[PDB]
What we know:
2 copies of one chain form a homodimer.
Chain A: E1 5-10, E2 15-18, H1 20-26, H2 30-33, H3 48-62, E3 67-76, E4 81-93, E5 99-108
Antiparallel strand pairs in A: 1-2, 1-5, 3-4, 4-5
Amino acid sequence: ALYEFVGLLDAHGNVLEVNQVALEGGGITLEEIRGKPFWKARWWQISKKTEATQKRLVETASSGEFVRCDVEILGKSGGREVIAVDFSLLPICNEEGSIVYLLAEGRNITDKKKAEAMLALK
Amino acid sequence: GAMALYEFVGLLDAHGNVLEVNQVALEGGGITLEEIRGKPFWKARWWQISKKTEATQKRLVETASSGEFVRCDVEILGKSGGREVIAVDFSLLPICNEEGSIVYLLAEGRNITDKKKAEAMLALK
């Protein structure tokens, strides 16, 4: 559905723009994180594993690969509280096909109706 | 400095309705996001120098909405809270999702006013 959180990154994952709702959820101001890697921002700082995971998702998108996965973030009450989020990274190319930005999107799934994945039988 | 690499940017939906705009663009136009959110980009005050400028921006957004990349120079009410005209190198990038469907348009612009002034001076014969 239309995102709840959204951010624009350059192709190295550095933060360019972030909507107010995401900044309020993480307890972060844009000026504090702008120009620096997205994985360093507080949303991704539950642990060294969550940080590393997000750096890896940014590397995958920076390569042209679309990312979608459920993740946990410090994303509620000014960075105090963990929420689960459906998270996506869209590589944005220019007319020649070179990746120039990344779009980070998320929606809070903490109250979303419990859903079943499609699992292979084999 | 380090951040000079980017100036105005906005995120539109696939039909050009406004979703997000950065503060440099809003302050330069004297516009708040709430006056323009969910309504066509070409109705926002940057593009209202005349009916011509508005009609061209609507064409540019329809071009990008069809999946084509747009870049060209334009003039906007984009300095001193919308009070002054600046020339801008303006681009719209259609953004596709994983299935290849257009989901958003990225609007970017850089102020090239001093740049055109300099080109005109170097052009003097």
